[PDB]
Amino acid sequence: GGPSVFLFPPKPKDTLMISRTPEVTCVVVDVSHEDPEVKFNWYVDGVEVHNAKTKPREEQYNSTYRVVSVLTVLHQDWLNGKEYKCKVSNKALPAPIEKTISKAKGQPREPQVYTLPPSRDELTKNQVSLTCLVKGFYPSDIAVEWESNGQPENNYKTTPPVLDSDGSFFLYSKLTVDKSRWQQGNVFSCSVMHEALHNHYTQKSLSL
Amino acid sequence: PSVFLFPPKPKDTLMISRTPEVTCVVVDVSHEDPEVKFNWYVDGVEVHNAKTKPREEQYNSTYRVVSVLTVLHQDWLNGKEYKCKVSNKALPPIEKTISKAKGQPREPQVYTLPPSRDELTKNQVSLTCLVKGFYPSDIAVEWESNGQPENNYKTTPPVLDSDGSFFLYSKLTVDKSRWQQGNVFSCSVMHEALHNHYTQKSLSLS
Numbered sequence A: 001g002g003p004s005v006f007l008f009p010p011k012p013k014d015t016l017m018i019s020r021t022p023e024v025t026c027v028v029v030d031v032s033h034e035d036p037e038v039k040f041n042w043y044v045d046g047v048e049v050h051n052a053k054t055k056p057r058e059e060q061y062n063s064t065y066r067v068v069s070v071l072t073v074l075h076q077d078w079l080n081g082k083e084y085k086c087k088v089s090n091k092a093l094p095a096p097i098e099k100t101i102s103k104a105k106g107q108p109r110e111p112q113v114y115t116l117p118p119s120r121d122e123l124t125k126n127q128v129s130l131t132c133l134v135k136g137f138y139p140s141d142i143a144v145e146w147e148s149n150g151q152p153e154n155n156y157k158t159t160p161p162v163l164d165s166d167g168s169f170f171l172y173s174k175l176t177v178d179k180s181r182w183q184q185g186n187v188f189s190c191s192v193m194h195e196a197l198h199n200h201y202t203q204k205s206l207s208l
Numbered sequence B: 001p002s003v004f005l006f007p008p009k010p011k012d013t014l015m016i017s018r019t020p021e022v023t024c025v026v027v028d029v030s031h032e033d034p035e036v037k038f039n040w041y042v043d044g045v046e047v048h049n050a051k052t053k054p055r056e057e058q059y060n061s062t063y064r065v066v067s068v069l070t071v072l073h074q075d076w077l078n079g080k081e082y083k084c085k086v087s088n089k090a091l092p093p094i095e096k097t098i099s100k101a102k103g104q105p106r107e108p109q110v111y112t113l114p115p116s117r118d119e120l121t122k123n124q125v126s127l128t129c130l131v132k133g134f135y136p137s138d139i140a141v142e143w144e145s146n147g148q149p150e151n152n153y154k155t156t157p158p159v160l161d162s163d164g165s166f167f168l169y170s171k172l173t174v175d176k177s178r179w180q181q182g183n184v185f186s187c188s189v190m191h192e193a194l195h196n197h198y199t200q201k202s203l204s205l206s
């Protein structure tokens, strides 16, 4: 026994557009089996609020339960670097655990987006890789997706943000397409959403 | 008390000059029983040559006991299991076993990619090394130029690919001036599936 608490930041895509709802999430896992009750206390910059909503206590799986408390947040507050403390109270837990999270406190830097064609070596394979390099951005809260002429593409993966040498972050997004589709005239785009970008959105095309 | 067992660093396993080490970490111990005895087992056989690190502590009620066992390079690549038996007096012993990923060994595919034409306006460009479809995750990636090693590069964490293999990217940063004078940069990769545990891919200007 002995429950652990994990606190999660709001999704970046949700941060960017006021049309979406950004949510900070406190997740309690591995809880007791005779105490199906936990109390959440949220604080914004040291001031308690009651915006929150606790999830039902389900299920285990393996043993125990996971309780999830979701407090949604204001778009501006997160970006302003407001602190969010999630005090989890359990009664099978000396002593109640507090977790704090916020935006990275530093100088915001706009990402440089570079689309990169498949290696001439990779041509021999049936599937080729379209690589989108995004570098020199801060903070790491960023969203990377791929699109085609009219519909978005999938089966692509994006690397975790990596701290660069100059103190900034970069990552890679690798889109996998059939080589037959590449040697045609198809146009692929790498769309990037970040707070430091103007209109919190940029896009780069990659064609043959 | 909870028991956590950690695998060696891939750079230490793939390099004969380094010492790969499995690490056993005990957390949530008391100041009523501040003493732990470790028992290490290689394929069911006990060994005695480990090393105990002294407690820290961890600034709570608890301490944090760490036992470290040096691992043979061939044993770890051959897939031998290492078990860390923790005995405490507030324990009705907890056993943790660890080894190399027991999956299908896949040879890495290495592709060097030139700077985007967009990046050329800048003073520093990016040389990119794509390494894909390798298994396990245990890999080592470094850059060299003209025979000498580069230092201004970063490598992403291995990423789990959709076909169950892994991939990562290694970004070398050079002055644009070096790139345009036709200097030749090579991307070095160390992995078990590779012949001689090594491959090399060069990237130059045209």
Ligand SMILES: *[C@@H]1O[C@H](CO)[C@@H](O[C@@H]2O[C@H](CO)[C@@H](O[C@@H]3O[C@H](CO[C@H]4O[C@H](CO)[C@@H](O)[C@H](O)[C@@H]4O[C@@H]4O[C@H](CO)[C@@H](O[C@@H]5O[C@H](CO[C@]6(C(=O)O)C[C@H](O)[C@@H](NC(C)=O)[C@H]([C@H](O)[C@H](O)CO)O6)[C@H](O)[C@H](O)[C@H]5O)[C@H](O)[C@H]4NC(C)=O)[C@@H](O)[C@H](O[C@H]4O[C@H](CO)[C@@H](O)[C@H](O)[C@@H]4O[C@@H]4O[C@H](CO)[C@@H](O)[C@H](O)[C@H]4NC(C)=O)[C@@H]3O)[C@H](O)[C@H]2NC(C)=O)[C@H](O)[C@H]1NC(C)=O
Pocket: A002, B002, B004, B006, B007, B008, B009, B012, B020, B021, B022, B023, B027, B028, B058, B060, B062, B064
């Ligand atoms: C009281 O306080 C304490 C202290 O805070 C609390 O402790 C915490 O307890 C919790 C849980 O109770 C622990 O959680 C678990 O954490 C691990 C991952 O952790 C690590 O990163 C943490 C970062 O947050 C870090 O803090 C922590 O210390 C770990 O860090 C790693 O440490 C190792 C060991 O040293 C490093 O590796 C080794 O590295 C060295 C090199 O390192 C350096 C150095 O700096 O020292 C580098 C130097 O460069 C080098 N110097 C030189 C000259 O070379 C030196 C040098 O080597 C010498 O040291 C110096 O001479 O070394 C070597 O390379 C070694 O060879 C190498 O072995 C490593 O680098 C380092 N990493 C980092 C990033 O720092 C998780 O794995 C756990 O996850 C599992 O369990 C959960 C449930 O129990 C699951 O939900 C979860 O899914 C997960 O499951 C498991 O999944 C896997 C598959 O993925 C399965 O295989 C497994 O079976 C499965 N388990 C299951 C199902 O049960 C978990 O999150 C936490 O670690 C601990 N925190 C700390 C800090 O100790 C405590 O809780 C408190 N009490 C309370 C609250 O009551």
Ligand SMILES: *[C@@H]1O[C@H](CO)[C@@H](O[C@@H]2O[C@H](CO)[C@@H](O[C@@H]3O[C@H](CO[C@H]4O[C@H](CO)[C@@H](O)[C@H](O)[C@@H]4O[C@@H]4O[C@H](CO)[C@@H](O)[C@H](O)[C@H]4NC(C)=O)[C@@H](O)[C@H](O[C@H]4O[C@H](CO)[C@@H](O)[C@H](O)[C@@H]4O[C@@H]4O[C@H](CO)[C@@H](O)[C@H](O)[C@H]4NC(C)=O)[C@@H]3O)[C@H](O)[C@H]2NC(C)=O)[C@H](O)[C@H]1NC(C)=O
Pocket: A004, A006, A008, A011, A025, A027, A029, A030, A060, A061, A062, A063, A064, A066
């Ligand atoms: C009983 O059964 C239970 C259910 O299986 C089981 O619960 C599990 O317990 C482990 C912890 O031991 C916990 O692991 C953490 O997982 C985090 C990611 O979880 C995401 O993703 C997982 C899948 O990967 C999902 O299962 C989760 O539900 C959750 O999903 C996300 O949820 C949100 C909201 O719903 C969505 O918006 C997301 O889209 C969605 N994402 C995905 C992919 O689905 C992971 O972040 C945790 O990692 C960090 O904390 C650890 C603390 O030890 C560190 O070890 C670790 O290094 C990470 O550290 C951070 O690293 C950063 C960068 O390095 C630093 O900047 C941070 O500072 C640092 N954090 C700090 C301060 O510590 C962690 O691995 C599982 O999530 C949890 N599973 C579930 C379903 O809840 C129990 O363990 C079982 N008990 C027993 C006894 O067996």
